[PDB]
Amino acid sequence: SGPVPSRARVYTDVNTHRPREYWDYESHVVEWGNQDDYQLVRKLGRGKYSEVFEAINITNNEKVVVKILKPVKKKKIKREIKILENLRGGPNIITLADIVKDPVSRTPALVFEHVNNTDFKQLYQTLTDYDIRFYMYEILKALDYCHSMGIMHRDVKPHNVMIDHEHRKLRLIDWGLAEFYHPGQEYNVRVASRYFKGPELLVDYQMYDYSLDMWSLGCMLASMIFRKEPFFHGHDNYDQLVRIAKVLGTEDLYDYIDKYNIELDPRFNDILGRHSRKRWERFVHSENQHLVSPEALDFLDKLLRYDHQSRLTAREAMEHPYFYTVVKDQ
Numbered sequence: 001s002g003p004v005p006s007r008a009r010v011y012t013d014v015n016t017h018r019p020r021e022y023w024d025y026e027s028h029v030v031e032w033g034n035q036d037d038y039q040l041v042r043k044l045g046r047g048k049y050s051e052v053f054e055a056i057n058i059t060n061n062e063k064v065v066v067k068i069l070k071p072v073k074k075k076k077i078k079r080e081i082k083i084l085e086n087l088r089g090g091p092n093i094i095t096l097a098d099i100v101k102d103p104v105s106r107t108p109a110l111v112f113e114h115v116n117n118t119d120f121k122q123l124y125q126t127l128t129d130y131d132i133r134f135y136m137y138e139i140l141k142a143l144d145y146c147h148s149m150g151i152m153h154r155d156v157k158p159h160n161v162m163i164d165h166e167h168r169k170l171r172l173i174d175w176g177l178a179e180f181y182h183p184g185q186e187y188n189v190r191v192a193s194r195y196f197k198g199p200e201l202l203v204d205y206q207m208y209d210y211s212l213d214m215w216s217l218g219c220m221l222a223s224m225i226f227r228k229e230p231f232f233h234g235h236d237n238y239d240q241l242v243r244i245a246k247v248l249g250t251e252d253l254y255d256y257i258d259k260y261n262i263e264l265d266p267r268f269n270d271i272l273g274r275h276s277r278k279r280w281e282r283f284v285h286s287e288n289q290h291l292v293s294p295e296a297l298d299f300l301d302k303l304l305r306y307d308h309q310s311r312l313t314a315r316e317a318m319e320h321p322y323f324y325t326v327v328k329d330q
């Protein structure tokens with residue numbers, strides 16, 4: 001018959017037990033700040049269609065970033081706003097400083113705190129072993145928090161992690177694909193970015209949960225400790241799953257498909273072939289060896305699992321010995 005149902009193994013009913021207005025974002029009444037408090041300074045690079053700007057709050061001369069939204073997507077705008085408000089003040093979550101609009105045209109915009117980011121393409125080349133452990137821990141604080149608040153981020157990738165490296169200051173940004181978790185809901189699998197899509201998205205398993213974000217995090221960890229960005233580089237979504245299978249092996253993939261009674265698109269079996277699981281040690285070479293340890297490999301192995309229920313939760317990840325020296329520091 002159809003696929004086996006699944007529910008999250010942590011934070012399952014957080015939204016069930018909240019007041020409706022916590023998660024019923026279409027009902028939210030937006031409290032608007034004053035557009036004339038902000039002046040746009042320079043456009044930032046956020047992709048071809050983005051409208052994201054460095055700006056200044058002219059009442060205090062603090063730098064901010066403004067994201068101008070397209071008003072056509074009313075329900076999606078309210079969802080992002082409600083999620084940002086629900087999570088504001090949480091650890092390592094970007095702060096929504098304001099929400100403003102043109103008073104006449106009503107074009108709305110989100111105003112974020114400024115982080116003095118170093119582009120990850122440059123930054124990740126310079127990070128030490130300790131730095132990777134530290135910033136992974138910071139991202140885990142943000143994911144445990146938002147998952148505990150009933151929210152899946154669904155677009156975890158380096159481009160959505162702002163790092164002010166000299167202040168060791170990290171923020172998880174771009175909550176525009178984030179969604180409230182409700183057990184049994186069949187979600188859109190056209191989320192995340194190709195290289196960070198979990199197997200559930202690539203095989204069209206819609207009843208996914210917070211654990212999708214842990215697969216994306218494991219992709220980032222692998223790219224950082226092995227200096228291979230992105231780590232799984234498919235040319236489309238089908239080839240993306242082949243790239244994962246050439247590392248994790250095809251047997252555990254077919255085991256996952258069988259466990260959830262997933263109907264695999266039939267061209268897949270041709271291109272997936274037959275691949276053994278590769279020992280993680282195989283990806284260590286001369287330029288990344290100083291970033292790899294037995295603890296890092298054990299931790300990565302526990303995030304990058306086909307079965308979403310078998311991946312570490314963010315809190316379980318924070319307990320892993322990979323972070324022992326970070327935890328003492330904090």
Ligand SMILES: O=C(O)c1ccc(-c2oc3c(Cl)cc(Cl)cc3c(=O)c2O)cc1
Pocket residue numbers: 044045046052064065067094112113114115116117118162173174175176
């Ligand atoms: O879509 C969003 O949620 C969102 C949120 C924040 C930012 C954001 O981007 C920055 C970029 Cl790209 C460069 C630099 Cl140097 C600083 C920032 C920054 O301070 C900042 O807040 C972008 C998009």
Ligand SMILES: [Cl-]
Pocket residue numbers: 179186187188
């Ligand atoms: Cl969805």
Ligand SMILES: [Cl-]
Pocket residue numbers: 010143144147210313314315
């Ligand atoms: Cl979690």
